[PDB]
Amino acid sequence: APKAVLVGLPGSGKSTIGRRLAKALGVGLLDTDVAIEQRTGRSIADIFATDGEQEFRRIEEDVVRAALADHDGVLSLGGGAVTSPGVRAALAGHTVVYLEISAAEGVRRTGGNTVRPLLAGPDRAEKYRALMAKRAPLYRRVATMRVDTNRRNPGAVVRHILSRLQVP
Ligand SMILES: O=C(O)C1=C[C@@H](O)[C@@H](O)[C@H](O)C1
């Protein structure tokens, strides 16, 4: 089982925080998006484009459940994994870190050329605010630790996480 599962919107810093956290904990980091691509042999964009989000979510839930049982390091979950009831159920009992971010900062961090089926222009900020409004309650429901990644440089966040993981 994972030492910690990271959840949050794209741009919340799961990849960077997860990489620095894994290093601090002396373990490996597994991103479920990467696991989905490795198992299916398909890009995430291709699944959404041809098979649709519904099928993508079923695939993702299966991969997430597998990782929760077999990965012993840090697990980062795709931004929308929590929309699946089965995923929230599987997270029960795990240490789950919710990386919180404001819509403004999240939008700024996701303005690159990374392909994002659910965060493509135009009106990207509007779409981001929409995802945040809908998923905020879900992240909160599964989280055992809520962390603010706004202004707080990465390093400070990782340190904050390591301390809260070690003490009551
Ligand atoms: O916000 C989402 O629902 C997603 C986030 C990415 O990690 C990928 O899992 C995919 O693009 C869907």
Ligand SMILES: [Cl-]
């Ligand atoms: Cl669909």
Ligand SMILES: [Cl-]
């Ligand atoms: Cl980007």
